[PDB]
């Protein structure tokens, strides 16, 4: 009975970061400040622990007490499928409070617990495909910061820097509200043209555009991208409209990738395959409710001979990418010329995703998710 | 480097069984006799081992030397996805010698090795869903043995015995060549009616018919089954014809389950979903080339909200069933009134799939695949 879960705990602590998020939820660099971060811990009878990080609201007491503890406490931690399905079945009646984000942090903590318990990296437990993987440099949303990402020329200069760092692929996130003049398709294309000019034809280029363009605007964006040899166009329209994506993919020659933000996990992603709403599937640990369903989405895509690109940085997504074949990249970012991604986080002693000068991220040979957690820092910086 | 594979070994031994296979490959009870059986062993630097069983031809020297050793030796055994994909990529150029059967035994041995190494049952490593599962009694193909499975009445009598044993579901395999008069749709339906009469309306009933009926004969069989409230019809036609199954499913009200024997693993099974060639998907460790791709098939089906029923008995299939939700049964069989399934095999010290009196199979709490191997018996009974 050493494998039985005895405790579920949340520690909220302050992290110092220059990353801010605007009113729409987009990241930007700004003043160094302290932000509240949460760590979820699952503990078993024998004292073994698994941990994962998320925003405090996602693991607030309402959610832990009403849903999470009731599913987990007293259960064999290795029954990840049963526990995941139990939590999933409680979402419908949760008054919209038990979200996929909550499922994700719980599932990740359970995987970390299994890996730490067995002394195994998560991707090795799943069944490894690769120990290193190419990363694309994922550029932060556009801004109005002088020398930052304010002009098309700003994107081109930053792209040169990224190529020097070793990235073999680069993804632009272009301008979005509340940027004063945004969005504008012509501006987005000028940024794309500036980057292509700067890096030449042998660097892979992708764009993740304003996410609420009309069909006609997304069509015009896509056409412009084809002339620049871009590899994909990502989420240029509201993904709640499967039909719009079917239409856009049918019209555009450039591959459309998605859905990133759509609900319904692997079940709804199957519908994207069936409807021909994308050329390349998308998944992500946070987007589909954990490592467990992310793996399902990867397998789903593979059975159709499709790639499925994994949204998001951090260990949880890196381990999905390392355990699977049909994904071209790990997404490393978001990046901005004002910030140094390789500096990491104050609550981690080292990077979860270090990248060599050839543009390969090497999965750390550390058990569980391999997050090198600075528990002392977290204790010294507690809120609640 | 303790996890590096150092050896791949095959031991052929004699097992005493009353099971024979006719020239078409169907099992029947006959004289007790000795049959050659193979055990594949994968060993790592630290001396840890994983084992799996198969027919000797499937792991003969040609296949071990030309393919299996070249992929496995010197590799981290935990890289199951990489090793599986490497073997898969060698099938095309293998002059038809590297079969899904070979991939399956290799993948199974790798899973057993991981589980044994960590002291974990394979389904717990994957991520457990259930520790016990309902089994259906899977009845051997029909025969011409008096009191065996020679008449419709014989099926009904055997079905009564199975309900007493605890089975909540029963699947008939009906008469096939080389049975002298077979096949015959009206006889198949007489057997089905005899079973329904014997067990009443609350036992679930399935049929797996002669596998090469024409469209029109399978249609007639299906219509007949609908009047008897059967749960599914399985492989009544050549599965090489996806179109025939789409037609049959569209015409029949009774659920069609498949494909069992079709090649192409999870990739081809996706096409069965897309074409609507079945109502319930089918997979099996031996049919799709291992535990790894059987899991993929289960996930594929789950994303479409479908069940995927797992073909075959033994530990390897039981662990797939135990790790997943969208499968109603474990297939326990093949069964015949002349044989006692619960007697097991001479080369296993106990059953991999013991069933309680309520018809639940309990997954053994033993590491790896949990096969309780009698290594001493195997050594005393060696051939090569
Ligand atoms: O609009 C945004 O903030 C970005 O699209 C963001 O969600 C980013 O993480 C993304 O979509 N990457 O692929
Ligand atoms: O034809 C046979 O021998 C049976 O159909 C056999 O393949 C059996 O294992 C099966 O199909 N079970 O579902
Ligand atoms: Mg995106
Ligand atoms: Mg297109
Ligand atoms: Mg069958
Ligand atoms: Mg039908």
Q: What is the DSSP string of B15-69?
A: EEEEEEE-TTS-EEEEEEEEEEEEEEEEEETT--EEEEEE-GGGG-HHHIIIIIH
Residue A131 CB: number of other CB atoms within 10 A? 17
Q: Is A252 annotated as a binding residue?
A: yes
Are A303 and B124 a contacting pair at CB < 8 A?
no
Judged on CB neighbours under 10 Å (0-12, 13-18, 19+), A343 is exposed
- Provide the phi-psi class of A235: left if phi over 0, else alpha when psi is between -120 and 50, else beta: left
Residue B55 Cα to ligand 3 midpoint, Å, equals 49
Q: How far apart are CA B180 and CA B196, in angstroms?
A: 26
CATH of the domain at B382: 3.20.20.120
Specify the long-range contacts of residues B352-359, CB closer than 8 Å, at least 24 apart.
B352/B314, B352/B315, B352/B318, B353/B135, B353/B313, B353/B314, B353/B315, B353/B318, B355/B135, B355/B165, B355/B166, B356/B132, B356/B166, B357/B165, B357/B166, B358/B166, B359/B134, B359/B135, B359/B165, B359/B166, B359/B167, B359/B168, B359/B169
**Looking at ligand 1, which residue's alpha carbon is closest to its atom 7?**
A26
Could you tell me which of B234, B237, B241, B171 has the C-alpha nearest to residue B206? B171
Beta carbons within 8 Å of B191's beta carbon, 6+ residues apart: B142, B152, B155, B156, B172, B174
- Mutating to test ligand 2, I would choose from B171, B260, B280, B321 the residue with most ligand atoms within 8 A of its C-beta, which is B260
* A147 token code pair: 């020398």
Residue A383 and residue A14 in contact, taking contact as beta carbons nearer than 8 Å: yes
Q: Which ligand is located closest to the Cα atom of residue B280?
A: 6
Q: How far apart are CA B253 and CA B236, in angstroms?
A: 15
Phi/psi of residue B135, each to 5°? Answer: -110, 145
**Which one of B80, B125, B300 has the shortest CB-CB distance to A300?**
B300
Within 13 Å, how many C-alpha atoms sit on residue A194's CB side?
Answer: 20
**Which one of B84, B274, B303 has the shortest CB-CB distance to A269?**
B303
Q: How far apart are CA A110 and CA A97, in angstroms?
A: 21
* B262 token code pair: 């079709």
Of the residues A71, A97, A119, which one is the last residue of a structural domain? A119
Beta carbons within 8 Å of A309's beta carbon, 6+ residues apart: A257, A280, A281, A282, A283, A327, A328, A329, A331
* B191 token code pair: 């057997």
| Nearest-neighbour CA in chain B from A309: distance (Å) | 17
CATH of the domain at B74: 3.30.390.10
Q: Are residues B369 and B303 in the same domain?
A: yes
Q: Which chain A residues touch B302 with a CB distance below 8 Å?
A: 266-267, 296
Could you tell me which of B79, B134, B136, B139 has the C-alpha nearest to residue B292? B79
Q: Is B294 helix (H, G, I), strand (E, B) or coil?
A: helix
Residues β-bridged to residue A355: A361
Q: How far apart are CA A264 and CA A296, in angstroms?
A: 13
Q: Tokens 């044989």 map to which residue?
A: B339
Q: Are residues B219 and B165 in the same domain?
A: yes
Residue B91 Cα to ligand 5 midpoint, Å, equals 25
Could you tell me which of B169, B132, B187 has the C-alpha nearest to residue B322? B132
- Mutating to test ligand 2, I would choose from B137, B173, B335 the residue with most ligand atoms within 8 A of its C-beta, which is B173
Residue A245 Cα to ligand 4 midpoint, Å, equals 10
Q: Tokens 């042998």 map to which residue?
A: A202
Q: How far apart are CA B379 and CA B384, in angstroms?
A: 10
Residue A272 and residue A259 in contact, taking contact as beta carbons nearer than 8 Å: yes
Phi/psi of residue B27, each to 5°? Answer: -75, 145
Q: How far apart are CA B158 and CA B165, in angstroms?
A: 11
Could you tell me which of B91, B95, B33 has the C-alpha nearest to residue B264? B91
Of the residues A97, A119, A141, which one is the last residue of a structural domain? A119
Residue A155 and residue A189 in contact, taking contact as beta carbons nearer than 8 Å: no
Query: CB contact, 8 Å: B71 with chain A?
Result: no
| Nearest-neighbour CA in chain B from A381: distance (Å) | 35
Query: CB contact, 8 Å: B276 with chain A?
Result: no
Phi/psi of residue A114, each to 5°? Answer: -60, -45
Q: Is A160 annotated as a binding residue?
A: no
In order of B161, B175, B193, the CA distances from B335 in angstroms are 11, 15, 19
Q: Are residues B250 and B200 in the same domain?
A: yes
Residue A12 and residue A38 in contact, taking contact as beta carbons nearer than 8 Å: yes
- Provide the phi-psi class of B314: left if phi over 0, else alpha when psi is between -120 and 50, else beta: left
Residue B208 Cα to ligand 5 midpoint, Å, equals 6
Cis link prior to A334 (omega < 30° from 0)? yes
Q: Which ligand is located closest to the Cα atom of residue A250?
A: 4
Under DSSP, the state recorded for B184 is -
Q: Are residues A258 and A373 in the same domain?
A: yes
Angle between helices A242-251 and A265-275 (to 10 degrees): 40
In order of A167, A314, B188, B310, B371, the CA distances from A333 in angstroms are 12, 9, 63, 41, 46
Query: CB contact, 8 Å: B127 with chain A?
Result: yes
Residue A245 CB: number of other CB atoms within 10 A? 25
**Looking at ligand 2, which residue's alpha carbon is closest to its atom 13?**
B311
Are B82 and A128 a contacting pair at CB < 8 A?
yes
Q: Are residues A63 and A160 in the same domain?
A: no
Task: Please calculate the CA angle A233-A239-A242 and round it to the nearest 5 degrees.
Answer: 100
Q: Is B318 helix (H, G, I), strand (E, B) or coil?
A: helix
B195 sits in which H/E element: helix B185-199
Residue A13 and residue A378 in contact, taking contact as beta carbons nearer than 8 Å: yes
Q: How far apart are CA B265 and CA B202, in angstroms?
A: 34
Residue B107 and residue B114 in contact, taking contact as beta carbons nearer than 8 Å: no
Beta carbons within 8 Å of A106's beta carbon, 6+ residues apart: A40, A42, A52, A68, A72, A83, A87, A290
Q: How far apart are CA B13 and CA A315, in angstroms?
A: 46
Sheet strands side by side (includes A27-44): A5-21, A27-44, A49-54
Tell which atom from ligand 1 comes closest to the C-alpha of A25. Answer: 3
Q: Is B250 helix (H, G, I), strand (E, B) or coil?
A: helix
What is the SS3 assignment for chain A? CCCEEEEEEEEEEEEEEEEEECCCCCEEEEEEEEEEEEEEEEEECCCCEEEEEECHHHHCHHHHHHHHHHHHCCCECCCHHHHHHHHHHHHCCCCCCCCHHHHHHHHHHHHHHHHHHHCCEHHHHHCCCCCEEEEEEEECCCCCCCCCCCCHHHHHHHHHHHHHHCCCEEEEECCCCCCCCCCCHHHHHHHHHHHHHHHCCCCEEEEECCCCCCHHHHHHHHHHHHCCCCCEEECCCCCCCHHHHHHHHHHCCCCEEECCCCCCHHHHHHHHHHHCCCCEEEECHHHHCCHHHHHHHHHHHHHCCCCEEECCCCHHHHHHHHHCCCCCCEEEEEECCCCCHHHCCCCECCCCCCECCCCEEECCCCCECCCCECHHHHHHCECC
Q: Are residues A147 and A167 in the same domain?
A: yes
| Nearest-neighbour CA in chain B from A272: distance (Å) | 11
Q: How far apart are CA A353 and CA A3, in angstroms?
A: 30
CA-based nearest residue in chain A for residue B276 = A274
Q: How far apart are CA B125 and CA A245, in angstroms?
A: 38
What is the end-to-end Cα distance of chain B in Å, rounded?
31
Q: How far apart are CA B364 and CA B346, in angstroms?
A: 18
Q: How far apart are CA A69 and CA A143, in angstroms?
A: 42
Cis link prior to B367 (omega < 30° from 0)? no
| Nearest-neighbour CA in chain A from B304: distance (Å) | 6
Q: How far apart are CA A268 and CA B132, in angstroms?
A: 30
Angle between helices B291-303 and B265-274 (to 10 degrees): 20
Q: Are residues B299 and B243 in the same domain?
A: yes
Residue B277 Cα to ligand 6 midpoint, Å, equals 9
Q: How far apart are CA B190 and CA B210, in angstroms?
A: 15
**Which one of B125, B128, B267 has the shortest CB-CB distance to A305?**
B267
Phi/psi of residue A192, each to 5°? Answer: -65, -40
Phi/psi of residue B5, each to 5°? Answer: -70, 130
**Which one of A79, A127, A324 has the shortest CB-CB distance to B128?**
A79
Are A79 and B127 a contacting pair at CB < 8 A?
yes
Q: How was this structure determined?
A: X-ray
Beta carbons within 8 Å of B93's beta carbon, 6+ residues apart: none
3-state helix, strand, coil in chain B (%, to 5): 40, 25, 40
Residue B357 CB: number of other CB atoms within 10 A? 8
Beta carbons within 8 Å of B240's beta carbon, 6+ residues apart: B262
Q: Is B355 helix (H, G, I), strand (E, B) or coil?
A: strand
Residue A138 Cα to ligand 2 midpoint, Å, equals 51
Q: How far apart are CA A319 and CA A112, in angstroms?
A: 11
Q: Domains in chain B: how many in total?
A: 2
Tell which atom from ligand 1 comes closest to the C-alpha of A26. Answer: 3
B233 sits in which H/E element: strand B232-234
Query: CB contact, 8 Å: B306 with chain A?
Result: no
- Domain holding B62, by residue range, is 1-119
Q: Which ligand is located closest to the Cα atom of residue A139?
A: 1
Q: Which ligand is located closest to the Cα atom of residue B219?
A: 6
Could you tell me which of A204, A184, A191 has the C-alpha nearest to residue A157? A191
* A36 token code pair: 């509240």
Q: Is B321 helix (H, G, I), strand (E, B) or coil?
A: helix
* B319 token code pair: 């662990």
Residues β-bridged to residue A256: A233
For B119-171, the DSSP string reads T-BHHHHH--S-SEEEEEEEEPPP---TTTTSSHHHHHHHHHHHHHHT-SEEE
Q: Are residues B89 and B157 in the same domain?
A: no
Who lines ligand 1 at CB under 6 A? Answer: A 25-26, 138, 141, 173, 176, 208, 211, 260, 311
Q: How far apart are CA A200 and CA B369, in angstroms?
A: 52
Q: Which chain B residues touch A72 with a CB distance below 8 Å?
A: none
Residue B54 and residue B68 in contact, taking contact as beta carbons nearer than 8 Å: no
Per-window interface: B 183-202 vs A, CB < 8 A: none
Are A130 and B274 a contacting pair at CB < 8 A?
no
Of the residues A52, A87, A119, which one is the last residue of a structural domain? A119
Tell which atom from ligand 2 comes closest to the C-alpha of B171. Answer: 13
Q: Are residues A205 and A136 in the same domain?
A: yes
**Which one of B80, B125, B303 has the shortest CB-CB distance to A267?**
B303
Work out whether strand B360-362 and strand B27-44 pair parallel, antiparallel, or are unpaired.
unpaired
Residue B227 and residue B252 in contact, taking contact as beta carbons nearer than 8 Å: no
Q: How far apart are CA B202 and CA B190, in angstroms?
A: 19
Q: Are residues B51 and B128 in the same domain?
A: no
Residues β-bridged to residue B313: none
Q: Are residues B49 and B160 in the same domain?
A: no
Residue B116 and residue B368 in contact, taking contact as beta carbons nearer than 8 Å: yes
Phi/psi of residue B277, each to 5°? Answer: -85, -5
Q: Are residues A162 and A108 in the same domain?
A: no
B111 sits in which H/E element: helix B100-118
Phi/psi of residue B265, each to 5°? Answer: 55, -135
């Amino acid at each position: 009975s050493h494998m039985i879960i005895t405790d579920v705990e949340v520690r909220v602590f302050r992290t110092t970061t220059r990353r801010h998020s605007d009113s729409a939820g987009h990241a930007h660099p700004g003043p160094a400040h302290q932000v509240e971060q949460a760590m979820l811990t699952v503990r078993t009878e024998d004292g073994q622990e698994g941990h994962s990080f998320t925003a405090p609201e996602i693991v607030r007491p309402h959610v832990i007490e009403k849903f999470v503890k009731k599913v987990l406490i007293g259960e064999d931690h290795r029954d990840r499928e049963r526990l995941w399905q139990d939590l999933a079945h409680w979402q419908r009646g949760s008054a919209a409070q038990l979200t996929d984000r909550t499922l994700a942090v719980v599932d990740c903590a359970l995987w970390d617990l299994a890996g730490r318990s067995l002394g195994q990296p998560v991707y090795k437990l799943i069944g490894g495909y690769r120990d290193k993987v190419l990363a694309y440099g994922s550029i932060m949303c556009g801004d109005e910061l002088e020398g930052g990402l304010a002009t098309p020329e700003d994107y081109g200069r930053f792209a040169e820097t990224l190529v020097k760092r070793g990235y073999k692929g680069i993804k632009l996130h272009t301008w979005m509200p509340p940027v004063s003049w945004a969005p504008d398709v012509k501006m987005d294309l000028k940024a794309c043209a500036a980057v292509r000019e700067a890096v030449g034809p042998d660097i892979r280029l992708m764009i993740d555009a304003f996410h609420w363009y009309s069909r006609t605007d997304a069509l015009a964006l896509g056409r412009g991208l084809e002339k620049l040899g871009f590899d994909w166009i990502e989420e240029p329209m509201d993904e709640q409209s499967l039909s719009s994506y079917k239409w856009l993919s049918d019209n555009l020659d450039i591959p459309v990738v998605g859905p990133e933000s759509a609900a319904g996990k692997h079940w709804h992603r199957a519908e994207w395959i069936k409807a021909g709403a994308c050329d390349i599937l998308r998944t992500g640990v946070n987007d589909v409710g954990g490592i467990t369903p992310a793996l399902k989405t990867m397998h789903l895509a593979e059975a159709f001979g499709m790639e499925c690109e994994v949204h998001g940085n951090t260990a949880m997504n890196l381990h999905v990418v390392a355990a699977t074949k049909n994904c071209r990249w790990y997404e490393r970012g978001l990046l901005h010329p004002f910030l140094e991604y390789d500096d990491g986080h104050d609550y981690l002693k080292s990077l979860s995703d270090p990248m060599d000068r050839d543009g390969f991220v090497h999965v750390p040979d550390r058990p569980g998710l391999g997050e090198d957690i600075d528990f002392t820092f977290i204790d010294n910086n507690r809120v609640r």
